[PDB]
Amino acid sequence: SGAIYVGNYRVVNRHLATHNDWANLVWEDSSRDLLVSSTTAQGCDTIARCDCQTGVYYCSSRRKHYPVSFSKPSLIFVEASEYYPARYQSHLMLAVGHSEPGDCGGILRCQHGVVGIVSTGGNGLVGFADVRDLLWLD
Numbered sequence: 371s372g373a374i375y376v377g378n379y380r381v382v383n384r385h386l387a388t389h390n391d392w393a394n395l396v397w398e399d400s401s402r403d404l405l406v407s408s409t410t411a412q413g414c415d416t417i418a419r420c421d422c423q424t425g426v427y428y429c430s431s432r433r434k435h436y437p438v439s440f441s442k443p444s445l446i447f448v449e450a451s452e453y454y455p456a457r458y459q460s461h462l463m464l465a466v467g468h469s470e471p472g473d474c475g476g477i478l479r480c481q482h483g484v485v486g487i488v489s490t491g492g493n494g495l496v497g498f499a500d501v502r503d504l505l506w507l508d
């Protein structure tokens with residue numbers, strides 16, 4: 371679990387969005403596993419606007435932050451799940467690191483701000499949904 375709070379927006383994994391997120395929908399994209407909903411209170415976070423390929427992510431299944439090197443945002447094949455059929459997930463960045471399904475929503479940050487959130491994983495892999503291209507967030 372986890373979300374980004376910027377301005378009057380809340381950014382979450384689309385597959386974890388609540389009834390309230392859908393009732394206050396701003397934008398969603400199944401191909402990116404992202405959903406943005408509106409909030410009444412002002413948000414705490416800054417979004418990075420950079421091309422960093424190194425950063426730190428929070429891993430809830432270890433209660434720890436880990437440093438990572440990650441690939442540039444791209445179209446990557448993701449196996450069928452309870453939430454989506456087999457498809458290419460876009461704007462996804464992969465890195466070598468530990469992750470489990472419940473780690474989705476953990477923030478990836480660089481020196482400039484929030485880069486994205488955990489969205490996929492594998493055997494010693496972790497994938498992040500990029501948010502740096504969503505200029506309208508701030």
Ligand SMILES: CSc1ccc(Br)cc1CC(=O)N1C[C@H](C(N)=O)CC[C@@H]1C
Nearest residue numbers: 403448451469470471489490491492493
């Ligand atoms: C951190 S997720 C993870 C981690 C390790 C392993 Br093995 C497997 C996973 C599961 C995973 O990749 N998922 C991503 C998928 C998607 N984004 O389309 C939705 C379902 C599920 C949460």
Ligand SMILES: [Zn+2]
Nearest residue numbers: 420422480482
């Ligand atoms: Zn950066």
